[PDB]
Write a protein that holds these residues in place. Sequence first.
Motif, mmCIF file in Angstrom:
data_model
loop_
_atom_site.group_PDB
_atom_site.id
_atom_site.type_symbol
_atom_site.label_atom_id
_atom_site.label_comp_id
_atom_site.label_asym_id
_atom_site.label_seq_id
_atom_site.Cartn_x
_atom_site.Cartn_y
_atom_site.Cartn_z
ATOM 1 N N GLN A 46 0.816 -1.203 0.000
ATOM 2 C CA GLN A 46 0.000 0.000 0.000
ATOM 3 C C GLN A 46 0.843 1.243 0.000
ATOM 4 O O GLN A 46 0.518 2.226 -0.711
ATOM 5 C CB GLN A 46 -0.908 0.001 1.293
ATOM 6 C CG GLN A 46 -1.863 1.150 1.388
ATOM 7 C CD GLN A 46 -2.660 1.121 2.665
ATOM 8 O OE1 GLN A 46 -3.803 1.486 2.655
ATOM 9 N NE2 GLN A 46 -2.098 0.641 3.707
ATOM 10 N N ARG B 140 0.575 3.837 -3.168
ATOM 11 C CA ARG B 140 0.167 5.195 -2.989
ATOM 12 C C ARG B 140 1.230 6.161 -3.523
ATOM 13 O O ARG B 140 0.849 7.177 -4.152
ATOM 14 C CB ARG B 140 -0.099 5.457 -1.486
ATOM 15 C CG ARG B 140 -0.594 6.791 -1.185
ATOM 16 C CD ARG B 140 -1.040 6.845 0.256
ATOM 17 N NE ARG B 140 -1.456 8.211 0.503
ATOM 18 C CZ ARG B 140 -2.405 8.667 1.222
ATOM 19 N NH1 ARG B 140 -3.284 7.862 1.758
ATOM 20 N NH2 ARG B 140 -2.509 9.999 1.317
ATOM 21 N N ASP C 37 -7.609 -0.682 -1.452
ATOM 22 C CA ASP C 37 -7.321 0.759 -1.439
ATOM 23 C C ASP C 37 -7.112 1.117 -2.902
ATOM 24 O O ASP C 37 -6.364 0.454 -3.597
ATOM 25 C CB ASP C 37 -6.089 1.128 -0.613
ATOM 26 C CG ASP C 37 -6.301 1.024 0.915
ATOM 27 O OD1 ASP C 37 -6.983 1.898 1.489
ATOM 28 O OD2 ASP C 37 -5.717 0.105 1.498
#
Length: 192
Positions: free
Chosen positions: A158, A162, A187
């Motif tokens: 993650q 991101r 996500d």
Amino acid sequence: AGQIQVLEGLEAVRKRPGMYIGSTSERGLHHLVWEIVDNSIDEALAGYANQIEVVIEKDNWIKVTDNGRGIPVDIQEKMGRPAVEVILTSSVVNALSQDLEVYVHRNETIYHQAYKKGVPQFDLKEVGTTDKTGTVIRFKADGEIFTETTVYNYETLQQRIRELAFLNKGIQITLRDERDEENVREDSYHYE
Ligand SMILES: O=c1nc[nH]c2scc(-c3cccs3)c12
Ligand SMILES: [Cl-]
């Protein structure tokens, strides 16, 4: 000579994998993801893709999907093999995976090949039809190479996904964990 050079390359990678990916520790495991994701990011940068999906599947398979052109499938000058096969049998990730599969959506056709330790298990085949383009790569890291751990860390994935989306604005990058079918986490990042 081309296919012989293929085989010698896979042997080299699997003999000194840390020279190719930094380490065979948990950091090298995650590096496999970054190598595949980076190829899809190049495809977005070229103007052809805008969505990348990373899935941690049951048993710590990784599936990366993009909506780019599809890896080409035309027969090569050099190798006399489909271009996607040449690309994937020279891939470090493939060499270091106990199993890897590709599906290419291109020319209104779905093409499939599978590999073990980088070795094609069968010739590239037409398996279906499609009205989209892009590429799906699914791999399982080889526990013979990654002797410490083969279990991905969602937060590690993650944090870098991101970051990648923030650096490459306009690319929608999605992370999903399906290892526990009872609690699936996702996500999805898309800057500007
Ligand atoms: O589009 C791609 N997505 C993932 N991996 C790769 S490796 C080579 C390519 C492409 C080159 C030219 C069209 S697609 C891609
Ligand atoms: Cl093609």
